[model samples]
Target: SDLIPAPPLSKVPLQQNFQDNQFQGKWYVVGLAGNAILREDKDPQKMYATIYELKEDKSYNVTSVLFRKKKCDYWIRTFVPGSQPGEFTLGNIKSYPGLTSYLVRVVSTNYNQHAMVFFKKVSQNREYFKITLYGRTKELTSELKENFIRFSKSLGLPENHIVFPVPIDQCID
Candidate 1:
């Protein structure tokens, strides 16, 4: 017990890494999207599942699938690297209201298992936030799940702000 010492622990270890290769690959959206204006109508609530095809520079091209009462359809969200680590900017014009751009931070991740990201969807009005959890597959480990949700609330993501939605199977093709 005296000779070999183990590394000390930090209360919260940010799993942020600089390796793009580790970050790139297939990721599931944890069946979750942020909660904003979805209650009475229950229309936007149909959004479920996503895919990210990471670009070479650590940016990503995402496919978002949404289900309306009529049925379902899919669209793309283009992400480009920002001026720093784990930071990303969005490509717009065809997107939602006043969505000029946004910022992305990999809050936590383990390369292939899961990723918790912080999103700032800045609009013409001011700023909007979108918090999400992701995994190598749709199912994430309980450890990371608790890690994300526990701290996400500390960010003040209010009780009703996290939405776990339905599952869509055919979007991978």
Candidate 2:
């Protein structure tokens, strides 16, 4: 057995009644749970923030910035909308090795306070899953955070794999 569990919904669906436009804007990444390895090239524990800008064509212009090593590691990417409301896919990532297929799903959201998002990254025969809980502000309610914990547990991610991050202002614009 592995340290993590398989996704609860392997055939993951987008959030129920997820409105793309409403979801667009700044979302502070308050928590993260995943199986990313530690390496010289990257540190998964870095504090980061994300912005999802909805385009006219229903695709998303996304930007993520992290405070790491006393500097900011910034990234910008585009995700083409999937067939459903909360689905988006990126055919390839420039920095990622091999032919990577990226999938993004908004597991659940209230459009105002918080959103639970899922990210699936498959590349070089390796599968990576990241579940995140974000909020309109830097802080989220304990109740909401608990829900994130329970949700990740259902997906087989253990408690130690989950971590709540401190918010950073370096990337704010």
**Per-model TM-score versus the true fold:** 0.70, 0.85
Task: Rate residue 49 of model 1 by lDDT.
Answer: 54
Q: Which candidate gets the maximum lDDT versus the true structure?
A: 2
State in Å the error of residue 124, model 2. Answer: 1.5
In each prediction, how many residue pairs overlap at the backbone (N, C-alpha, C within less than 3 A)? Answer: 0, 0
Q: Identify the runs in model 2 with alpha carbons over 4 angstroms from their true place.
A: 1-5, 8-13, 37-46, 91-96
Residue-level lDDT of model 1, residues 33-64, one tens digit each, is 34342323354344355667777656688776
Highest TM-score against the true fold, candidate: 2
RMSD of 1: 10.2
Q: What are the C-alpha RMSDs, in order, of all predicted structures?
A: 10.2, 3.6
Q: Write the per-residue lDDT of candidate 2 for residues 22-52, one digit (tens) a residue.
A: 9999888888887662222243454578889
